[PDB]
Nucleic acid binder design. Structure first.
Lengths: 171, 290, 191, 197, 136, 106
RNA sequence: UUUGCUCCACACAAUAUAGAUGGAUACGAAUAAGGCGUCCUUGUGGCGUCGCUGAACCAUAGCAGGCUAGCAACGGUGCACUUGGCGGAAAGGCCUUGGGUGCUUGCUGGCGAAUUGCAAUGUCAUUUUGCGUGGGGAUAAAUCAUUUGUAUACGACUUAGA
RNA sequence: AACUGGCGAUGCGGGAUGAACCGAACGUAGAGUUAAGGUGCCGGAAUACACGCUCAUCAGACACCACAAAAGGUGUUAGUU
């Protein structure tokens, strides 16, 4: 479904030798709490010597966007697996939320490179709003000044199967 | 596996089914292309094949190694008494083809043409075209209206003619009736020509001329049921052949598990409609002289 | 990629007028009128100041922007044809057999007839499209000139001459014989 | 809804229109389709010609007269599509195909009546602009349909007749509207308008 | 003589262009395009009409012929202020599109007695109009 | 005046079925003008008559009738599921049926 | 070879209706464009307006629609004739000046309905037949048998024969 | 050959068709809900909604499975310096 931003913070199991472990935190986009904990444990296994049995999760909190109703450019650094090897890439997308931003990021990854959520890692998602910082033409073309354009060839959906006059695609 | 040695197929695949023609008289399948500039004229004629004979003529072929010398040629003489035109039909062009709109006949119909319309002519009341002539037999009763219909419609005009079987030496007494397209002038001109020529003779000296290439349409001589050897020209099987040698040895492979349409089979030979083209008229002559 | 807006500008001379319906454009000036149907490209036109026409493509791909460039170039070519006109000069190049080029008129159709190319009995016949005039230029020999209003028509006539004058069954690098497009320019060039 | 539905084929995609019409016939609606020669197929004309050439290649080895019958007419091409989408070997399929009628051009009983459109199958509404398409009449003439010119002439004649009819109807309707304006602004008209008609 | 080109202008999407959201939680309500996210989506606001600030698709909204001046990215309060200043809803209601929508809505909201009254009034109007056609 | 229809036209389309097995005890009905399950809900629980004519007079009439009712919806396009006193003859696929306004709730 | 056959209306009997229960309600072309109206150098023209679905437009009140009266009827709408036409793509339909009658809910009235008993489809508009109800109507062919040979295994074909 | 599960011995829904695959195992009926598989029409079910990519003069279309490779193409799309 639509992803949700979670902060998941957990530690290794406190032993007698070393109480109060380092309390590692992660920001991850997942469908819900179960997949959030799963992804947190997967990444913490990829990074540090700890597994789910040997550790615990001390907190998992959803993070709502500070302002979900303003347009901001998003720079997403990701790494993904292809049929041949692993590649890092950087994309920029115009969107109103980080969660919707990773929604479109995953959709575009699947569309353009056949990469699945299985194969995609989101390294970083950064909100930006400065022009001349975005590097992609398919974003700068909308960040141009006084952007107005028509929508040629409007197609109107019909409920009935039969229409009694030829359609007009004006707008 | 492949044939050990290649050879052309026996017979023509465009001339089958080798079945009997639907009638003794072979109709013109396609008339010559219509031209409106040229005057209205018959595109065909009906004759009777009289026989064959020999002619001697000086060949004029400027470049042959044996040019300007006498040659002997075989010619076919056909008896062509002037065909009596009576009747005219109209054809409108439709998304389905040429559809016959109406046919208008003439006042008097010949006894021979009525015999053509009949089967048991002698034991009959001879009631044919009687009420048609009653609708006719006036100046403008109802035939001029049909003429106007053929003028307003019927992009193709075909006159109806019948042969003079009484003039010919045949013992038939039954006229042959056919349609001839008029490939000149507008539809109005075609209909006017047909009406003026209603109930009268057209001469082949007016239709065709000397030094002309024409097409003969006829039903070939019938030969009945025939085997493959003479029907298609297949090889005769060797002398030491059990249960027959005038046959096709292999009539198909194991697969497809069917005899194919292209395999030569015994059946009817002759009596097929045929249109031979490019026959040069060597003479158009009349019998009203020696 | 889907470039949101691609706009281009075509200038018109002061002595020419352009009428643009849906996608059928006519241009009329000193040398006459030319017409073009562009109903296969989906490009919008606008007038700026009676001397500038903007040609626009919205949400177009690479092919669509290429088509926008093509339509701008085509309308430019037709405008310069209506103003100055096009002239294609061709040379006959032969090694041994002089190429005899003349103009015949069957029912007034203005055919071009080529004889003696490589000493053959062939008669190479080329129809002349409308709006194309054939002149055998003086002060120079084995020269033909096709002058017209439509660059496409004059160039296709010249290409027809080249295609008939193509040589067969021989090494072309030795048998360079043929009628070749030497010059393509304007009738009002350097005027 | 209606006893008979008449759809013109011009601007319609053959497959989508055939599917819609087949479903309607199975549901029990009589349908006639005109302008089958102006029906459209998505894809290049060469692509559709190659497809029809493969169809022509398909034929029974031992008897082409019992093999598949490759009808060349545009209306019969549309009928072939519809019969492929209808289960034609059962009595229900025979009933649906009896309910269906297809024509090239518009014969009198249907050009004197109303023609509807199917937005789900319309080329303009469906195909992405710039995508190449094919005309059924051109494809049929290429594969051996012999009556494109006759249908074109008859359609031109019908179009002039319909243009004159439309001019007469438009003049009558505009006179009716002018007289309605003169007799308008009455209590009845104001009451209907204020009520909501 | 002047070179002439067909106008070919039709309802550009822009900031301040007011749209009619047709499906969803509003379903027939006025809003204003506050910002253009992509070619297929825009951030819109409908504070006066009752449409919350939201990212929507131009395939979900319908642009309307009229618009008004509005800085891009304007908040809900500013959009409402400029909407009231420009009287966008009054112009929309004056437009024949909204009159058609309201007529359709009421005609659907009619009762059976009202339908009978419509029938009687229409018969009267038909009588008068036929008399006028005959007199003309 | 000329119109006396107190029912709503519908079409008996087919039986409840999988790809290769049908259930004659349940029939599918397409109500005319209904294109959504939302209107199908209003049409739920409503009597249906299949009226046909026979050449033989049975009980003072040459018209026979089968009674059933719209019970629940079927799909996303306004098709409803009907159960009749006797299952429809299956030759009446795509056949005219009448849906009555009773038992009324409005 | 003791009214057979055609056309035109009708109590009554139809393997019965692939399934009417107000109307299949007629420009074309384009869709990165159109429709209508208007104005003129009548043109790829200026201007105004419309769409954003048919949720439309016609027709729709009356014993399944009765009987009987009025008001400006200078209208609307069923039925039957010729005059004037148009329509051949499958025309079989589309119009039109005429005369007689009905009805009219455009507006106002008077009388009747019940008991089908709380609902039962509650029955309304096709191809033919009859020792029919009668008005017009001109009273034939084919086959077998015989014969022919342009044909042919037999059939069939091509002819002839009061 | 090993472990397990199946077919043999077993129907049923799906994979068009199939002993083994996927679901699920079976008395006679009714209602509801699903599994696997699907919802353009055949064919019951969205000519759904959303984002992209692809135009093939041998497209591609759903495991078992009914085939395709090395190599190459500013065709087009997206990605460090």
């Amino acid at each position: 479904a639509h992803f949700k931003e979670y902060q998941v913070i957990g530690r290794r199991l406190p032993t007698e030798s070393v109480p109060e472990p380092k309390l590692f935190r992660m920001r991850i986009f997942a469908s819900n709490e179960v997949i959030a904990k799963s992804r947190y444990w997967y990444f913490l296994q990829k990074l540090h010597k700890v597994k789910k049995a040997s550790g615990e999760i001390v907190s998992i909190n959803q993070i709502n966007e500070a302002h979900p109703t303003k347009v901001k450019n998003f720079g997403v650094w990701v790494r993904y697996d292809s049929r041949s090897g692993t590649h890092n890439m950087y994309k920029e997308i115009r969107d109103v939320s980080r969660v919707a931003a990773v929604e479109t990021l995953y959709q575009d990854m699947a569309a353009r490179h056949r990469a699945r959520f299985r194969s995609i890692h989101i390294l970083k998602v950064a909100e930006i709003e400065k022009t001349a910082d975005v590097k992609r033409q398919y974003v700068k073309q909308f960040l141009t000044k006084d952007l107005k354009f028509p929508l040629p060839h409007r197609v109107q959906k019909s409920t009935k199967t039969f229409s009694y006059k030829r359609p007009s695609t004006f707008y | 596996s492949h044939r050990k040695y290649e050879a052309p197929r026996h017979g023509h695949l465009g001339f089958l089914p080798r079945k009997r023609a639907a009638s003794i008289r072979a109709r013109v399948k396609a008339f010559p292309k219509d031209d409106r500039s040229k005057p209205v004229a018959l595109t065909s004629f009906l004759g009777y094949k009289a026989g064959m004979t020999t002619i001697v003529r000086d060949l004029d072929r400027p470049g042959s190694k044996f040019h300007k010398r006498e040659v002997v040629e075989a010619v076919t003489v056909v008896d062509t008494p002037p065909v009596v035109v009576v009747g005219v039909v109209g054809y409108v062009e439709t998304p389905r083809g040429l559809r016959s709109l109406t046919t208008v006949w003439a006042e008097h119909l010949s006894d021979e043409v009525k015999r053509r319309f009949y089967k048991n002519w002698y034991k009959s009341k001879k009631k044919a075209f009687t009420k048609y002539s009653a609708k006719y037999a006036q100046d403008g009763a109802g035939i001029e209206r049909e003429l106007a219909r053929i003028k307003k419609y019927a992009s193709v005009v075909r006159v109806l003619v019948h042969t003079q079987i009484r003039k010919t030496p045949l013992a038939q007494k039954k006229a042959h009736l056919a349609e001839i397209q008029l490939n000149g002038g507008s539809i109005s001109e075609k209909v006017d020509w047909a009406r003026e020529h209603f109930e009268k003779t057209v001469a082949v000296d007016s239709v065709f001329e000397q030094n002309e290439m024409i097409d003969a349409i006829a039903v070939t001589k019938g030969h009945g049921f025939e085997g493959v050897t003479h029907r298609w020209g297949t090889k005769k099987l060797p002398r030491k052949t059990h249960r027959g040698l005038r046959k096709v040895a292999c009539i198909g492979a194991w697969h497809p598990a069917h005899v194919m349409w292209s395999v030569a089979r015994a059946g009817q030979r002759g009596y097929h409609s045929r249109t031979s083209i490019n026959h040069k008229i060597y003479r158009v002559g009349k019998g009203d002289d020696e | 990629m889907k470039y949101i807006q691609t706009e281009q500008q075509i200038e018109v001379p002061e002595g020419v007028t352009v009428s643009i319906k849906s996608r059928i454009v006519k241009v009329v000036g000193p040398r006459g009128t030319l017409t073009k149907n562009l109903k296969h490209i989906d490009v919008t036109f606008t007038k700026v100041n009676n001397q500038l026409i903007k040609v626009a493509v919205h949400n177009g791909g690479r092919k669509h922007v290429a088509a926008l460039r093509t339509v701008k170039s085509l309308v430019d070519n037709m405008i310069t044809g209506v103003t100055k006109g096009y002239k294609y000069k061709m040379r006959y190049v032969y090694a041994h057999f002089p190429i005899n080029v003349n103009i015949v008129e069957k029912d007034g159709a203005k055919f071009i007839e080529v004889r003696n190319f490589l000493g053959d009995k062939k008669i190479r016949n080329v129809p002349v499209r409308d709006g194309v005039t054939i002149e055998f230029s003086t002060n120079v020999k084995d020269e033909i000139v096709l002058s017209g209003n439509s660059v496409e028509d004059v160039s296709q006539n010249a290409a027809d001459l080249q295609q008939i004058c193509r040589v067969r069954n021989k090494d072309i690098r030795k048998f360079l014989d043929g009628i070749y497009v030497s010059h393509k320019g304007f009738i009002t060039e350097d005027l | 809804v209606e006893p008979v539905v008449v759809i013109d084929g011009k601007g319609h995609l053959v497959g989508r229109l055939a599917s819609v019409v087949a479903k309607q016939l199975l549901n029990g609606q009589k349908i006639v389709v005109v302008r089958a020669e102006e029906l459209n197929i998505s894809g290049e004309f060469f692509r559709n010609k190659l497809k029809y050439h493969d169809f022509l290649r398909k034929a029974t080895a031992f008897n082409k007269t019992r093999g598949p019958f490759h009808f060349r007419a545009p209306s019969r091409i549309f009928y072939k599509a519809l019969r492929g989408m209808v289960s034609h070997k059962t009595a229900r399929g025979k009933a649906a195909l009896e309910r269906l009628k297809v024509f090239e051009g518009i014969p009198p009983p249907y050009d004197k009546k109303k023609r509807v459109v199917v937005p789900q199958a319309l080329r303009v509404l469906r195909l992405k602009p710039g995508r190449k398409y094919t005309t059924l009449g051109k494809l049929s003439t290429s594969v051996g349909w012999k009556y494109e010119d006759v249908v074109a002439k008859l359609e031109a004649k019908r179009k002039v007749s319909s243009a004159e009819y439309y001019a007469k109807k438009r003049a009558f309707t505009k006179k009716v509207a002018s007289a309605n304006a003169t007799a308008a602004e009455s209590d009845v008209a104001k009451q209907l308008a204020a009520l909501g008609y | 003589t002047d070179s002439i080109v067909k106008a070919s202008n039709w309802r550009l999407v822009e900031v301040g262009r007011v749209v009619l959201i047709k499906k969803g939680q509003s379903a027939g309500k006025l809003a204003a395009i506050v910002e253009i996210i992509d070619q297929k989506k825009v951030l819109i606001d409908g504070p006066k009409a009752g449409v919350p600030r939201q990212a929507i698709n131009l395939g979900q909204v319908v642009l309307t012929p009229l618009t008004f001046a509005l800085p891009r990215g304007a908040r809900t309060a500013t959009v409402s202020k400029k909407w009231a200043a420009a009287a966008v809803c009054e112009k929309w209601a004056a437009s024949s599109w909204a009159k058609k929508i309201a007529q359709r809505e009421r005609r659907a909201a009619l009762t059976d007695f009202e339908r009978f009254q419509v029938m009687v009034l229409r018969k009267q109007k038909r009588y008068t109009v036929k008399k006028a056609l005959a007199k003309a | 005046a000329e119109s006396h229809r107190l029912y709503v036209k519908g079409k008996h389309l087919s039986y409840q079925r999988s790809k290769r097995v049908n259930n004659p005890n349940v029939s599918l009905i397409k109500i005319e003008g209904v294109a959504t399950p939302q209107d199908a809900q209003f049409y739920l629980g409503k009597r249906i008559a299949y009226v046909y004519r026979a050449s033989k007079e049975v009980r003072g009439s040459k018209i026979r009738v089968m009674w059933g009712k719209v019970t629940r919806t079927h799909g996303n396009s306004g098709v409803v599921r009907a159960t009749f006193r006797n299952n429809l003859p299956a030759k009446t696929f795509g056949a005219s049926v009448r849906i009555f306004l009773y038992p009324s709730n409005i």
